[model samples]
Every structure is written in structure tokens, then in C-alpha cells.
Target: ISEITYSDGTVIASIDYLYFTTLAEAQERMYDYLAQRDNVSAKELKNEATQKFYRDLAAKEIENGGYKITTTIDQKIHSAMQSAVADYGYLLDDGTGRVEVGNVLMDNQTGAILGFVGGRNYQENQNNHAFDTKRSPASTTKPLLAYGIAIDQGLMGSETILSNYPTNFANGNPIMYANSKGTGMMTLGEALNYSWNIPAYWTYRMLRENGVDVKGYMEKMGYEIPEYGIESLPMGGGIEVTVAQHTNGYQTLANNGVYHQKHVISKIEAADGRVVYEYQDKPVQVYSKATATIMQGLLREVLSSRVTTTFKSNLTSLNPTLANADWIGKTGTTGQDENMWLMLSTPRLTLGGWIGHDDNHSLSQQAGYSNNSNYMAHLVNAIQQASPSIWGNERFALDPSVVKSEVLKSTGQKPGKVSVEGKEVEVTGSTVTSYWANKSGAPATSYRFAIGGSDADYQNAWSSIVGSL
Candidate 1:
């Protein structure tokens, strides 16, 4: 209300600032600021200004009282810039490039690609593959055959033994390596390590005849099938695959049988400071953790095994200087001259490289040149050699979070009292009894318990027994 009339003939009103304790009180003060801006009458302005002033004070109080707000922004733009840059295509150098092939590069940690090159003339002209030409994956398809389906159904393990003799396939007879000097029986571990054709054929034949859908399983893992022709579904058949699919397929095994769709971008923030969209590192569990671990463990053994004429044969030359890191790899070639593939993985990455003549001509007299193998080994070695420098300088350590699933067990059934050569062990009441059948039932001169105890004590006892004998 008007308190008095001023000498200038203007109404006068008095007001005082007051504190507001609630959000409602603060909002009511905003109306006062608005009224003041509009130059309302003195009494009305006093009330409105009080509301506005108190609103401002309340906001300050609220902020000090722990009221806070937050927002996120995602910004990402897609452009054809890579295509526009001519020099971008010239970044990589060509040395001993294969005429026709598919190639892939992957980051072990996320199984993402840092770069990829596929097609003919990726060397001569730096051109990528045309849209139509396809090549049969050949023996490169065997791992999927073994680990992808065979292991899923519990058909085999590292120790599971099978005959590696000549075998028949629907298409033709598959045979073991003619140069093999071993006996007929081979552990599944050996079969995989050698990629023996007969053992692989038997595995597939047994699985297929017993009602397993090989193609369905492959498709479930995200492989597209050709509409026509004989489905190249065999261990090494007419199936043609690009470099990308093959790399990811192996990645699933390395990822503990989990499938994570590869992506280029990790996240995006908007210009308005709000998250537009972000990628979630969600992984799909496609295989049993135990099975995947077991398979990976076997592959590790295959990589380290000293057996010559096997996958790790090349390691003999490299092992002395090999890093302390762990890895597994495989090499494959199509019969006659379709394609060549070499796939490898570490705890953090999986990479697959391929090579071939564009016209489907023979490399190394149709024997599937080992050039792809050499290239892959070089890529892996180069990555190993360079990763330390690149990541070390950036202060980004390798992710140490991946869990490997593997178990080690001593050979044979029960824990024996002692390990011995040239003797058959017979266990009796925590003591081992030995009979010399080869010695014509002669009473043994002496016996010694050599397991879970001291060798010196056993030797002393054996000496005492020998005196009696």
C-alpha cells in the first residue's frame, strides 16, 4: 500500500529484503524481477521485486545447499574424407604383395581392426578387391570345423585320441601327411596342431552323419551362405569367404567364445553438451567359457609344442628372441590353389592374413605358398615389436583384465607313488609293487618308493633291500 506522497507528486513505498527458505519462495521472487523490469507501480513493484530478489537469493542458497545439475554431450560426424584424400591410400608400403588375397588387421584387446586391405592389386595399384570375386577358404575353414562345432558338442578335447589313418569324405578320400612318422593314433591336440586331413575328415563325417547341422552352426556365428553351388561346408571345400568374416570368426574363440561386434567408434558427444549415443561394450556369450578356455589352452600348447612339421615349426627360428607374451596361430591352404590363410591371436588381439594369385592360379605349384604364413608371422612379430613403443609412449598399458580358462592335469589316472621308465607300476596300499615279467618272474632285488617323498630315503632303503636280495 502507498505510505505517502512525495514532494515531486510521486507515490512512495518502502520495502525490505527478506530471505526465502523454499523453491516455491524463490520462484515467487522471479515474478518480482519481471514486474520491476516492466516498471510496475511502486507498491506492486515492491512486492514483485521482493519475489524476484528473494528468488535469486533462494537459488544461491540452493546451490550452496548441495543442489547441482549435470549434462552430457556426444558429438560425432561421418564424412567421406578418407575417400577424398589420395595420400591416405598410399600410407602402407607394398613388399612381396600377393597377387590376389584378403587381409585383415585387428587389435587384440578389443578385437578391432586398425587397418584392413583386401582384393587384387592392393599391391600393384593399391586398389581394393572388386565386389564379385570370391575364393574358397579351404583348410582355413578347419578350425571352425573343430572348435566351432566339434568342441561345442563335446566330441573332442586335447587328449581325445583318434586314428589319423586314411579316411573317406563325401567328396573324396582324405589322407594324413604322407611324411608322418608317427603311429596311427593321435590326440585331438595333435590332429589340430598338424591339421591332419584324415582326422579332420573323420571328425566332420562323424558329426554330420550323427545329425549335426554344420551350416546352421556356422550361420549362427554370423557367416552368410551363397545361394547356389555346393555349400563349401567341408573342412576345406568350395566355400568362399572374405577376410573380415574369417578374422571375426577366430576372434570369438580368442574372446573366450564370446562374440563382440567390432566397431570403429568408441563413443560420441553432441555439440549441445548432451550425449547423443554411446557404444556399450556389451559382449554376447556364444560358447561355454570352459570349452573356450580349454580350446585356447590347447592352441597355446600347439603354438609352443616342439613337435616338428607342425604349426609351431617356424617358432624354432623365432623362439629364442620371442617375447614373454603368449599367442596362438594357425595356417591353412586350399587344395590345388584357391587361397591361403594364416590366423593368429594374443590375449588382446586376433589377426588374419591371406594371399593368392588373382586368377586362381597355383602358388608354389598349387601347393598353397607359405607366403601368407610368413606375412602373418611378420605382422604379429611387428605388432609385438612396436606395441611396446607405441603404447609405452602414450602411457596406455595393455588391458590386463582378460581371463583365460584353462586347467592342467598330470597324465594318467591316479597320482602314482613314483614315475619310472622301463617299468610297469603296480600300486598296493600306498606302496608300489613291481614284478619283473620281462625278467622271467625273478624276485625283484629291491623296491623304492619315489613319489611324494625324498629320493635319498628311497635310495637308502633300496640299498638295504638289495643286500637282502
Candidate 2:
């Protein structure tokens, strides 16, 4: 492959050679490069020559013709992202005074991959970190698996109440959080805003109970959970995903809830321009427009919702400047913040970042930045600053039937009437703006409920929507 450029006249990458190689190709490519090292002897050089001599004798058996393929990578963004990961990984001191970063950027409307960094260096290691490396998605699970299901199933809204109800595993190990251990309640927006664990766990239990197919939704979005552990659905420690896989999940959200598979090659053809094959997108609607619209609203809140909530995930200091656009994102980390992640998107593109030690050990926290090692926020802003017109004035597509209204955070219902100034009017002070496809006709389900199990025995199943069908 000579080069990869987009239809818009921008280069995605300039490729003289692909780093990945097979045995025979490695023999040809690494021939002089490896055998001529300072420590190499005449004996090594002779073997290298012998191999080539034998290979040349059978040259007629070699396959010479190759196909020319069209790719969708943007070299500008790809170069920037590579620098972003490299610049960030060098500063971290996980074990060997450096960490490895995996990242991918994709078009929101189409699954066309823009660019990515497979690993820190290809010569030192050949692992495709972004596309092949698998690691826990951490708190990213909240949006991709749990909250997405609840909202799509119409079980919750941005302002819908989610209990901080204390929960435990089936084995009796109590579930906990970085902050409160299931203390007071918070809105669905607030739960995600804080990246609290208890709320997500509760939400997952609620969905699984109502037969919402939490795992099924993720699968439809092109994510498969192999072990099928319920706790991992919301908790995120058990299940693992590649940076590319996780990014496409967000790509589905940005693409109006339709899951489009990320494609590296747009089309391939012979040297004569006869079309060989083309990639056709068969998008799947994993969630409704209302669900995505509301979820997008919630994620936007995760960035702008609170200022002093230092414990939660937000790009307060690392926030990027968008002229006529807004950003939707989530931060993820596994146990002890060992692996920090930043999943972000504009109206046009989605970027996924992962930072961890190559050995898969605990990484230093606030070791690089204030509270995160993931420099994605700064990486994005740096690129935008350099190129003002990179992120255009694109707005997210909203569900037409969805509307903004006021609702109670504590009760998950429309503001109740109370005597005010000799008038029984709705209380505005206690209400927060919320979006809903349908303003629930009845009162809230239940204030709080226990997790149920068979034998009428249930545990970990908590919901703000408390009542029965």
C-alpha cells in the first residue's frame, strides 16, 4: 500500500510499508536490518543469504499481485492521536517508568475508522493495542451496558431517581463505591455524573429483573459479553473490551443509536480499477432515538453538571473549546484506578483512550494529571487548538418526540403541588430540568425496594420505579 486518503482530499496515513508481517515477508524486510547488527557475525549473514537464495529459486511460486484498497483514516487526526498517546504514556511511571496507551478514533455517522495507535512502538512489540488488546472498560460500562438499557426500556430518565440502596453479591460480598456506601438517593443524571458504582449496579439489577436484556442490548450494539456475569454488566471489572470495540459502542450512540461496524478499508480494487469488493454498512438500531437523545443529554451533563464534585469524572480543567458544538463523554477506570480510560465524542467523531501498564498491573493515580492518567481531553483540545476548523459546527440529532420538562430528583415524578404564597403551585426550587419521551402518567413506582430472587427471594435488584405492572 502506498498511501491512504479520504474522499475529501485529506491523507489518513502515508504508508510505505505495513509493520505487521508474516514469516516470509519478515525474512525479506528484516533481512539486512537484523543480520547487520553490531553483534552479528558472518555466520548469521551467511544464513540470511542462504534463505534468500532458496527463496529466489522458487520465485515463480511467489504471489506478486496485490489489491489496492481505499481507506478512511484521516492522517491529520491520526498523527495527532499518535502524538497524544505517545506524549501521555511517556510521563507515566507504572512499573518501568512508562505506561502504554491504546486508542482509536472513528467517524460517528459511518463506522469508518479515522486513525489509531496500536501500541507505543511496533518494533519493540507487535501487539495491536487499540484493536487487539483487551482490558476492563471500567466505568464506561455504565453508559454502554447499564444506563443505555434502562433508558431504552423506558425504565428511567435523566432525572429519574436511582436509589443508593446498599447491595451485595449472591455470594454475600457487599458491593461498595468510592464514596458513599448506598446512602442517600441521586438522580439518574447525578449517578452517572458522579460515576458512582452503586447506582449502576442497582440500575443493572432493575433492568435484568424487568427482562430488559441488558446484555442483549450490548450485543446488538456489537459488544458481546462472554462470561455473562451480571455484576460485570454494571461493575465493569469482569468483562473486558478492546479500545476499538469500546469506541464503536460509543460510535453507535453518536450515530443515532444505530450500530455501524468500524471499517478500515472502504473498498478494494485491482490495479486496473475493476472493483474487487466494497464494504456495505448494515446498521442495526440497538436503541431508540429517544434513548440516545436522553443518554447524550446525560453524558453532556457528566461534563457540565457539577463543578465541586471532584470525585466524579468530568473534564473541568481538561475541557475542550467547541465553537458551535458540544461534547459527550465518560471516564472509566478499573480497580484502584489502575487502568484509566477516556471515551469522548463530538457530533462527528468518537475517540476512545486507554492507559495502563503493559504488564497489567496497578498504575499510579494522579500520577500524570490531577486525577487521571488519560490525556485524551488535553489531546483533543491540543488538536483543536492547532486546527480551529477540525471539529465543525455540528449538532447532535435529537429525537423529535422527546421534550424537556421539570421533574423531582428525589421522587422521580413531576413536581408535586404545595401551598406557596397562598397559592397551591408546583415547587420550582426542588425540581430539575429533565427529558422524557412520555411524562410518566402515574406517580413514581416505589421510593425504594429490595433486590428480589426466586422463592420470592431477590437481592441487589433496586429501582426508583418501584411498583409492579
Candidate 3:
């Protein structure tokens, strides 16, 4: 049995684990006992009492909700965080490697920090190349189109068809029309496996013409765009994303559109055995789980397809026999082929890595040898391999126990209800706003609309329409 102390210094006995129930129930029980002693009733206390007894308890429970109240930082997770800092060698001043860096490790399921390392300066130096650098995404950025945004909007599903035709950028650059044709019109799943660049470019055009503002879309996805002449959206232009931001962003999709800040330290403990900081379990659902699940399927198709992955089974190998965990990830290279990146996840972790030269010198080869494949891939691979060995199966567990039950896709509501909102929305088009009304036949306010449709139909409409100034 558990016990609670009331304000009048009276002790109330409670059934075991009852203290952990709702505040109303817990307080009701306590007040009932208090009322009995005072020859009064619980209802009377609710009205006449100067202090609401349940308020404090309710506040406490709500404050501690969705979190494992940590009395102290887990020593093992702390050790891992520290090891990662040292492994990166962030403070080494020699010309051999980077002198500053930033890194965070989090629980895959709940986004809890196992460890976090680096200061703002360290992160800025590593990401911005000591001068606010912006690097062009080569290939890894493909998933942002194929899975991240497109599938989330329900514009296309895994089985949705895409044409492998030559498309041009807003600036009139040919996008794989002549030289880089895909396996022809294929499913969204097949396009991902093949990483058809032309299809990705065309998809962006489709979203644009369909009233989905490309630049505005990135902003909604949580990006700060730089103001410059002629926006770099339609031609796959002006996309500057950080490694940390990219990891968390992709994790949002993996975690069913719930974006959690990538936390490194699971818990912080004070010197006197009190917990000062514990990992925050704040989850903001950014998209429907249905959309996220569909995106995952498309990503898996990429991994399974030889055309997208270049017939390289070794690309995803973490060790000799074991393959990487069952999470959707992507690799990005630059148009100039200077940098190569890999961002992959299991349900438990989101891991990303970048490889480039210390100096401004390009890699030895352009298309053939873009970035440091063996070194950077090995770094991320080492971390993935260590996940099982260091923390056992607990750290590497991909699918969370909470998400085991199946849920409906359209209902933004819980498992069974259909999810729809009655409000005006703006969709970006190439010229005119593409707005649509609800079943009520009301005049829709914004151009952006999502109806049951195909990508090409939406893209053509978005690019050609115009609205009143």
C-alpha cells in the first residue's frame, strides 16, 4: 500500500500504485478520508475548501507526463555520450581533421537523449565550414522529395505511378531527360529504389504547380531560408540543411511526423543526487502516421532495388553478416559530386554522416569517386555496429512497442475516425494559386489543395495557374 499526507497533517492510506492514477481520482480518495474525519463530505470540501487539494497533484502529474522521472542520469548512456565526443576529437587543433563538432545520440522510439556533445561554436564551425557554408545536396536529398514531402501530402502512395521523362528546372537546365532516364513510368516505390533524379525534379514541379509552395513547404518543414535573388526552389536550388536538423527532420517522418529535438543527454544529475535535467519527451506530430508509413515503404523499395542503390549490397552493410536495421535512409551527393552523405534510421536511432575534404579541394574523381565513402561510411557504420555491442538489443530495437497496433490513415483522429479539417488552405502553384473547396462547395481560400489524385495531374495544374494580385 502507498500513503499520502494531506494538508491537515493527516495521513491517508492508498492502494498500491493508486498514487500514479489520475489526479482527480487520487484527490477524491484523499478528500473523502479527510471529510470522514471532519464529519463532512467530499462534495462539501470541493466547494468550501480554501485550497483545492487536487490542483497541486494534477499539476504535478501533468508536469511529469510523458516522461520517465529520472532521479539521476543513467551512467551507461552518459558514458556513451562522452565517448562519442572524444571519438569525434572535436578539440584537436592539428591540421589533421576538424577542430570543432557537434553530435547527439537519442532513443530511437521516444527521442530520448542517451548523450549530447559540443557547444554552439563547435556546431557552427563543423556545419558552416567556419564561414556559414552551404553545400549542394547530391543524392541524399532525394528522399525529401520521394518520401518526405510527397508521400506525406497523400499526393502519391507507394504504388502511385511516376513517369521517367526528361524534366527541366525553372532555370531551363535539363533534368535527366535525355541522359538519365529511369526504368520508365514506375511506382513511387520503384522510383525511390532507382533514385531517379529526373523524377524527383519533376515531383517538385508537380508539387509547385499543384499550389504547394516549394519554398514555403521547406519553411513548414522547419527551415530558415536565406534571402537571395531568384529563389532556388524549382531547379533544386537554395536548399541548405544541417546534419542535425536533417537527422531530426527525417526522424519526424520515421516517428510518424512527430518532431522531437534531437537530445544527447538522457538525464542530467546534480552533485547531491537530485536530478536537474532529464531528457524531454516532447513530440510534435508533423504529419499523419499513414503518410509516414507510406514513405517508409517507398524508402524500403529503394534499399531493395538495384537501380537506385547501384547494385551495391555492401552499401548498407554494417558488418560482415548483419545488414543495417530495418529503417528507411538515403544517401546524398552534390551536383558537382563533392560531398557524399548517408542518413538512415532504425526505430531506435537516426544516424547521419557527411564526408568531404579538409581543404576546398574536390575529391580525386568527380562522378566515379565523389566523397569519402570508406571513411565516412565506416564512421557511421562503426556507431551502428557499436549500438548492439555496447547497449545490447535494447538500444537497437527499431519498432517501438507502443506503435504495434494498426491505425487508419485518413482519420486524423485516433485508430478509427477519419481525420479531416474544415478550413481554408493555400497551395503553391507555378503561377496561379491552386485552391479547392470542401464537400460543402464553399469557395476555397488558398491555392494548396489535396484531393485524391496523381502527381502529374497536380503538378501541371500547380505550374500553370495564376491568382489575383
Candidate 4:
């Protein structure tokens, strides 16, 4: 048999396996056989029942292969993930028992998959969770595609106010937040930490108005934006994607908005070490460094902000090491606890994990529970704690062109007096500082386009509200 190599250049040990079926191996006794029982018709079931079992018959058709797959799987990280997954079931006692779990860990610097856990028990569950499993990405798509896109286009930033006011659907049934709030104002940080629905909805509207290619940029990373009828791209309602695909976007963000296609098997080789099929990575800059840096700072607060909202998952508080690891991640949970997704990024690695049943049955949890991301963060925290070198590298930096400017908190624009028609006007605004990428391009007070209106009373309202504070 040929050999293999881990991304770090360690040889993966090979082992031989034998496959045989015994006379006593009844279909009723086998987990795999019983799972297929329902698929068999009445006649098929009888035919199978009458068939005699053989005595330790060899499955010779599966011949030993020639080319060996040298993957990026490092045994250290794999063991850490394996250990972490083995303990994940304990947290599920509050619901429908331990469900299906898929996890992938990749080195962002190298785009190498250091560890991949396909399912809870691969032998019992014959599905590939990382590659085969597809579920809604939910709010995790926000940073990679939604608000982050707005920042990339120089349209939004931290502290930029978003109208938390509800906008009705086509049926005029108003869309609401997780807690069903329909009125208020949300700062960019507040919208993110709270996972505000209206803000995200408005953000998508802004993107659509500007005609930013949401689908094109997402495809570049990996996930094909699954288009739903009346699609809510910002909310990620129609996404059907594998664990690996979901993590690809976050990996792009962590790499300063660069998308380096992630590969599992680095190369196939002959027994003599001659390269067979080698993988080459072509990096694509999806979002500029300024957008990436702004996003890094924005999502950073999603972890550290002491917000009272239960709708969002602040994964950092789960462990001190994870809190300080300079991580940016998003957590997504489908309706009725059907699926739970958490994709995180550190300076070196991007980890994606999802907990759900393959059959689409709910994992059974209380409402307002963001345990999906919290539990997966445990795996990353363990891996980081085990190997101290994977974290605390160079810190994230803003782009050169990006500058901090004090703008009217109300309008997120320059505060100064300007003549209207004849005489001069003070502009009548108070100031709050925010990150600005395009200095000459006026600060984006996203609220103006929020409801297809202008800055008449809106600016006046924030002038006193934020001004007094």
C-alpha cells in the first residue's frame, strides 16, 4: 500500500482491514441492515429473509487501491476533535438524545484541513457530515455576505444606526425580530450582537439597491447561495450547504478577505514518493483588507459585548482562552431547533461545526438556546489549549486608507455648517466617531435608505438622543 502525508509533513500510518459476513449475522441484528428495512418492499423483505447467510464470506470485490491519499489531517488536531465530539452528547440530554454532528477544522494561513469529524460515530452512521451534509447557514451568512458586503462597498460601519423599525412583507404582515420587537433603533454593533432581523433585511436591501453581486462573491468562496423564492439572502433562509462550505466563507474573512480554496488530500503519490495529483491553491481577494478589518472589529464585539439579548450566541464567554484568541464567528440555528451551526475564525484556524439529526428531527432544546455555537467552541478551545502555538500571532490591522472620523451620530456624516440657499445653517447635529474606509465618500448613515426615506426628523431625533448621551 502507498503512504500519506499530513500538512505538517508527518506520514500517516496505514492499516489492513478484512470484510466478511457470518451465518449468524441477521438483518434484524445489524444497524445498517435495519436502517434499510423500510426501503425494502414486502416481496423484497421475503426474498431477503429466504436468502441463506454465508459463513465468513470475503468481500473480495473491494480490491486494495494503488494511489495513496496524502491529506492535511494532523493526528494531533484529529484526536483533539475526536475527544471533543465524544463528549458533545452529554450536552444533549435536555432533548432528543445525541443527534448527528459534523465538524471541520482548517488552518486559515494554509487552507489545510487539520481535522475533520464527519459524524458522531462513522462506523454506525455511514454519512459524510462535512462533505455530504447540507443545512441552512442562517445568520452566519451575515458577516461573510451581508453587512460585511455593505462595509466593503463603503456603505456601513460600526455605530452606524440601522432602523430597527419593522418592514412588512408582500402580504403586509410585518417581519419581526427574534423576541418579536418591531420598533427601536440599532447601532451596527447592536444589530450584530442582537442579530437584529430588520437591520439585516435593510442591509440586504442596500446591497440589492447598489446591485452588489451577492451570489457571485459567495460562489467564489464556496457556498452557492441557494436561491429561495422571495429569497432572504441576509437572513440566509434558503441556504443548503455542507459544513465545509459554510466554513469556507469565514476562512476567507480570517485571511484578510482572501479565499484560498481549501483542499483535503494535498496530493496523491506512488509508493516511491513520485507525485500523482498535487493540489494548487489560487487565492481570490473577495473583500478588501479594509472591509475585512472593519468586519473583524464589528464581529469582535459579537463575542465581548455584554448585551442582554438571548437571540445571539456570544461564544467567547464559554472559555477564557477562546475569549482572548481574537476569534470572529457566527452562529446559526434553524426554526424549531432543526439545525445548529457555528463557524469560527482565529488567526490561524477556522472551525465549523453543526449539530442536528440527519432525519430532520429536532435536537430538542429550549427556546432562546444558542448552545450550538457554544458547544462547538468547546472543541476549538480544547484544541487551542492542547497546542499553544495555534493562537496569539500578529493582531488584525486596519487598511491604510481607513480613518476614524467624528461625524454626526444622527446622520453618520461630517458635522459642519453649510449655506442652504442664502444664509448659513449650522447643520444642527451632534458628533460620534466611527470607522471610515472611503474618507472622501461621506459617512453612511444607513438609516436614510432603511425605509426609502430621507434625513429630516431622523437626524434631528438622534441629535438629541446620542447627543445627550
| Top lDDT model | 4
23-61 per-residue lDDT for model 1 (tens digits): 332233333434554666767545766656656654553
| lDDT, residue 102, candidate 4 | 78
The positional error of residue 324 in candidate 4, measured at the CA in angstroms, is 1.9
What is the lDDT of every predicted structure here?
0.45, 0.62, 0.42, 0.62
TM-score comparison, 2 vs 3, better candidate: 2
lDDT of 3 at 99: 32
Error of 1 at 456 (Å): 50
Model 1, residue 201: what's the lDDT?
Answer: 60
Q: For candidate 4, which ten residues in a row score worst on lDDT? A: 16-25
Once model 4 is optimally superposed onto the true structure by TM-score, how far is the C-alpha of residue 387 displaced, in angstroms? 2.0
lDDT of 3 at 287: 54
What does the lDDT read for residue 256 in candidate 1?
70
What is the per-residue lDDT of model 3 for residues 1-469, given as tens digits with 9 covering 90 to 100?
2323222223323321112222333333334434454565556656744236544543443344332222112234434444544463432222333433233344455654343333223423333321124444456665654345665554554444455544455578655522463334444555565455656665665665676544444554565556422223322346555555556666776665567765433332222434434446666666556556555655655544534333135445535333544645665532333444555565566654444444534543222122233333333444544455432232122123112211112111112211123433233222211111111111222222322223564454334322211
Misplaced by over 4 Å in model 4 are 8-65, 226-230, 306-322, 333-336, 363-370, 416-430, 439-441, 444-469
lDDT of 4 by residue, 302-390 (tens): 65553421222334555664566676666564223677666667768888877777887766544114455445656766677667677
Ranking of all candidate structures by their TM-score, best first = 4, 2, 1, 3
TM-score of 1: 0.54
Q: How high a TM-score does candidate 3 get?
A: 0.53
lDDT of candidate 4? 0.62
